[model samples]
Target: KKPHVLVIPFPQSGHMVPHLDLTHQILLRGATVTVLVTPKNSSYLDALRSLHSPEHFKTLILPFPSHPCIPSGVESLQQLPLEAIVHMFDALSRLHDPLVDFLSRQPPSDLPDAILGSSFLSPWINKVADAFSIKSISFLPINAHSISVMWAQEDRSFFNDLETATTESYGLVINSFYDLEPEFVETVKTRFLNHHRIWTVGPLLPFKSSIPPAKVSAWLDSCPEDNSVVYVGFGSQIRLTAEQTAALAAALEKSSVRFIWAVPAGFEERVKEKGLVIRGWAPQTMILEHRAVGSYLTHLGWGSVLEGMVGGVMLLAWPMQADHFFNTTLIVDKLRAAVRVGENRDSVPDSDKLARILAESAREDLPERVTLMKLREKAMEAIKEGGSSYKNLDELVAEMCL
Candidate 1:
């Protein structure tokens, strides 16, 4: 029988995007997939649904569980301040009973052959899967080493709980290709789990068909030189303090390099001739892929980091929190592909110093740029047919089908 899978994506877009990509990948392998999403995140599945026929792809919407710490209508992390993350996870765990009830009503033929749940869904997801005799796999969108770092740094019960949950699951899936972190992958396989049922199926980028908007595309085409522009975005969840915003504004103004910054208050008017100040969401992958874009000023989130690497863009890493510090170390120190925005996440960069780094990175011949290009080739190769990432996904799907 064709395998049927139920996917549970964490509510945050960073986590959710990879889960969506995994859904598309499994569907391509002839497996029918159903993604479980909260009501607010349901729209995210619209684009994925369009990529495949209805029969093979579907969505199951559950109401965002109510909690005192989370206000009504706040379903995803994008809707909350970063500090509320723990409370949000607490709120999400309440889904166990409701999810179990919903699954119990499904007939045996309609039940999923296996369930692929975000790592955040954890012990409860394992419990739900076991209740129905379905295989459960914990899907992690972050790198293996960063997971270890977070586990060590944050003494909160959350990571401890996550450890227990993953241990109980049938297997683990990480959003990293072996070429990206071979040593860490081997380390996690040996130490993190009792069994070696782990797969590195990534650099899971959005499908190539997704494109940038027309206005943005035209502006990029208008740039006179390749590798002359910088794309500045800190992902959707990063909220810069006013002082931080001012520092970046000053740096961009002084650098005199062409830029497309995904932010604004008055910065748009100040750099109208030399830059494009996107006030809201910008199409990141499409923007990074453009030849005129040479560097990215990023928060060092793994999703943005991988996108920068794949685009062959040099990075100005300004990691803020969570696993960002570890990612910065990987790109800047290990891969030799990124320059630091500051000494660490806490330090506010001097605008002049940042401006100098920005100016230097615009040069196509910079050593970091060459290093990034090499890594980019590896990332591209890993996702192609017969590549490590492609075959791993195939193995994952093959196992689920069995």
Candidate 2:
């Protein structure tokens, strides 16, 4: 019998990508999957259908309560005000029971055997899973190093300080590898030993052969190799002011790195006039895999970080908020695969110093040698047979089977 799995992500784009990737992986492994999305973003599911046949996967669109403050077509949840997010969460909580009630009414043959949910918003699904007696696993789509930092003892205060956060003493069960940092892995294991389960089952992008349609394949084909273009994306939630946008332009120009910048709608004209700026969303995974792409200038969002790592591109880490700054610190200070541009002042670098740093850093071969290749190899190992991630996934499945 197929293991029926229901997958839900935080109502944001970055969270959605990894959840979808995991969904695809489970389906490939012969599990029956249903992906839950909100009505506000059902178009995303439709977009997925364009890439593959609908028969390959099942999608469930939950009803999102209409809100005046939350604008339509806003892709990232980060863009919403904190109050709105809380309100949305409240509404979602109210709907949870109905969702479970619906699922409960499903024929025995169609009921889910397990629930795969994003760690960011798992608390919501946790209640439903418990009520239904379904085993649930929370997937962290970020790199293991970032997860280690987030779950670290010293970092508890950081999360406590955030306005939107609760519970200082929480551990992240991440999607990364023990091989990336043996010492850090030991630290995480020791610290969260009793409190949480840390699983490293990631770099969970669908294998290239598994990707259909190949729309991004053509985009990569059009660009030149040998450092001709840098890929820029700030996940789904990151936004910058017009002033900050101008500063980024100056930074990119100063860095002397040719780039394919993916700017959000309003800021396109300002940035695009300078270089190749893609106004709307572009296929990030496909762009990262492009040979012409030399480095990724990113906001250190987990999804973007993993995509860059899997693509084996050197990184320019610019973290925005939430755990992103901590993630950036890990990459630059601990991993050394990327360079960090310290705080942005006045939305611009002080005397173009940050830009110069980015440019100089990209020119160095050390990133590929020191961090990129090794990290990529470790990521691959974690997902392979007998690896930490592989074993953990088996354990998770076994628990569900019981």
Candidate 3:
């Protein structure tokens, strides 16, 4: 019988992209897949559907109860206020029985043979899987290195220390390259070794095809060859104050690189004079695929980082909150493909520090350097036959089959 996998991503774009990438990977292995998403994030699936044929895959929209207190723009799993986030989770847990009941009633053909869900589901998802009599595997969208750090005793203290000073904590550690660090991977492995089914299938973004289809962009025709313009995007959850926004604009002006920047709706005026400030949503993958994009100035969100890496763009890291600082650490400190910008100050520098960093880093040919390139090569290898992710996935499926 064909294996059927039900995949659920946390209710955010960053989470959804990796889940989808995993889904595509499973599909390549001949499993039929259904992606479960909340209505709040269905637009992402909608965009994916536009890019791929829907008949081959399925999207299940799970309605989440709305809270008046939770603001719209605060969309990340980490960024939501603890109380509000807990409330939402509580509400979802309350709705679980009905959701499970609905799934139970669906014909076997529509049901999943095995379930793949995000780690954010935590304590609840295991329960749900037990109730449904299906195999469940938790998916982490971030890098394995970040996961190792988060799981570290010392790092946990560092996160707690950071949180005491700021509500925005950097506790969540995500590595973009779990495949490259065998020791770190072993540490993560030992923690879940007894569980037998939890697999670290990450650094998934860098291996994807970079060729953009005809529908990709109208701007592509006029753009320069790949690696000419810098791509800038913060994850959906980050909100900059007016002062911070202005400061960033000044930095971009200083860097003086041809760029594509995605500023949130209200912050458009801040960078209007300097470069392309795409208001609202921009097609990130499409932008990365553009030949003109040479570097990425990002908030170090795992999703954006993966997109940039997969596109082979150099990175300019500017982390705002959560594990983003840790992610920046991995990109700049661990992998030389990127450079970091420290805290935003009151007086914006005259030049774009990020842009200057990008220019200097690229000139150094950091992307092709042995250390960084080897890591990148390992990322590609992991998703291939007998690779860590591939073996981990096969083991997970075999256990599920049992």
Candidate 4:
């Protein structure tokens, strides 16, 4: 029988996207996966299960039963306005009883060999796993560089346990590669977590390929030259106010760099010909991989960082929240792969500052770009056959079978 693993995500779109890659990776190694998700995001899992049989992939959909204040069916993070996020998070935490009650009542044969879930749910993940005598593993979708700022700095614990987090379950299944972060990995393992084993198994990218975009494809084809356009996407979780969005739009226009931007509604009308602003989902990987994309104005999420490196594009880091600020630090300060444009993250920079940074971002012949491409090559090599990421993934599968 294929080993069964239960995979749960933080229920945010960004969090779920990469964990989908993790699920597909484990399935390739012959493990059966059961995804526990909320009602709204179940369609994503529904689409995932359609990629394979029920025997290989199944979902346990959690009902986000209505609350007094929060609206119903707002279980998916992307669906809610950014203002509703914090309260929504509080609502997600209150999911413990329903989650536990459901798991506790499941049949023995339906139980999994292990539980793989997010750190946000750490308080209850291991608790429920232990109740069923199942092993638990926290799949950290963050990068080693960003994580070092938190745990390596001082007194920061990974999780709670009567048994230490290291020994109680398997170690962290990090989505980073070995060669890319050996120094950071060594610091974490030696100084902080000696008992918990660390596996650097990334850059864990997308599993399924996207259908080609007709609109974005035509835009890219029109410019068909390497490093000719700027690809801008701040990511899903961040919401930019109208005033901030307008000024940035004006900056992109004034910068004189050709661009393709992904912004919310109301900005599209202002984008004359200088840029094509995608109101809905822009094909991010497709845009990043295109020959015309010179640089990325990014929110510095782990996926974007890894993608930019792999694509060999320069970065203009504009952090949104959470660990993104530190992620920008790693890219700009430590790695020298990116530049942090203008200090005022709240509003847009003045036209001159924005234009200057955008112009600088477009220059292909940069010292930072050269050095980061070398690192990118190493990151790429780790995932090829018999390379570090390849072998580490093999090691991870071995541990799963154990």
lDDT of each candidate versus the true structure: 0.83, 0.63, 0.59, 0.73
Off by over 4 Å in 2: 46-57, 66-79, 143-173, 181-196, 206-225, 264-274, 344-347, 367-369, 384-386
Tens digit per residue, CA lDDT, model 2, 1-402? 457778777776556666676666566566666777777667666644555556657888767655555676543476676446555555555557668778978996677887777665555576777777776666666665555556555645423232112111123345566676666666655654344556666766654422332644555566565555677676554467766776777777666666667662344345443346665656677777776776787777666677788877878777767567767667777777777764532245553786666565545366543577678778877888988877766665544455
Per-residue lDDT over 129-186 for candidate 3, one digit per residue giving the tens place of the 0 to 100 score: 7676776666666665666666555544423432221111111222234455566556
lDDT tens per residue, model 4, 172-234: 767778776778877655654545567777887776412338767887889856687888788
Measured by TM-score, how close is model 3 to the native structure?
Answer: 0.75
Worst 10 residues of 3 by lDDT: 164-173
Q: Return the lDDT, model 4, position 76.
A: 67
RMSD each, Å: 2.4, 5.4, 6.5, 3.6
Task: Judge candidate 4 against the unseen true structure and give its global Cα lDDT, from 0 to 1.
Answer: 0.73
- How far out, in Å, is residue 220 in model 4? 0.6
Estimate the TM-score of every prediction.
0.94, 0.78, 0.75, 0.87
lDDT of 1 by residue, 1-402 (tens): 578999999988889889889888888888999888889888999888788888899888888888888888889898888888788878888888888888889887899999999878886888888889898988998998776556445564556787767756788898888887888887777767667778888889787412248789899999989888998887756577777778888888888888988863553456457877776667888999998998998888889888888887888888877677899878888878888886544577788888898988868788888888888888888889988989988989988976
- Lowest summed lDDT window (length 10), candidate 1: 263-272
Error of 2 at 301 (Å): 1.5
Task: Tell me which of candidates 1 and 3 scores higher on TM-score.
Answer: 1
Largest TM-score belongs to which candidate?
1
For residue 175, give model 4's deviation from the true position in Å.
2.2
User: Which parts of model 1 are misplaced by more than 4 Å?
Assistant: 152-156, 208-212, 264-268
